[PDB]
Amino acid sequence: IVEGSDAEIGMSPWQVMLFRKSPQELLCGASLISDRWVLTAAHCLLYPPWDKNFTENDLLVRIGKHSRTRYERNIEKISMLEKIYIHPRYNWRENLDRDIALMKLKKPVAFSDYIHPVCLPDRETAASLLQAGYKGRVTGWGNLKETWTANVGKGQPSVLQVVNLPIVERPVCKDSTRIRITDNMFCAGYKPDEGKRGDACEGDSGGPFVMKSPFNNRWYQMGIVSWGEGCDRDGKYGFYTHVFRLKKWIQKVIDQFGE
């Protein structure tokens, strides 16, 4: 996460760390939607070009973590993947069309001050919230800067960063990149005229894009960190996996598959 700020304690109870058993490592971001279900971007799991193709065996999920690096004894909860669920229409091979993965946890995770699930947006939460101008909250433990030779300083965040980015208009999203955009995705970030900073970055993907509803006081997951071109680039925007458009796959699985 670029041009963000360190998160606050329990500022994001649903954040999930996709930790690589070995090499010991951060795979992506993820989000707690249940005591047992975890949302992630599909591509954190499967990306042929980087040759990504993790078996559930290979990962652990770390929920309730503030520190990136520390292993937080008594606040964080490290989980085992029971079963991974990838979007069937996920197109890595292109523009990452339907960048969504689900994981079922062998066992139920314990709610704490630090552990709690977010909401999934309803057709009406979405209609009203997912509007150009409206600000989302991007959380993760990814890059603080676009990968650069010339960049000096430590690129990894000690603590989880938080950045607030407004929803952009398709057209604008569309006119920004030569990539085929789709309805399965969205863009968030400061328009040029706005002269402001902050984006997610390499390692943030998998991570929630949440909006708070005036409507009833809850936090809803709007987008999954997907992709982009550069991080915090002038004229560029971040691309989110539009959760709602993709919700019925989500519910279908959770349903015949578990809780």
Partner: peptide, 4 residues
């Protein structure tokens, strides 16, 4: 978060 892959670049194009």
């Amino acid at each position: 978060r892959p670049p194009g």
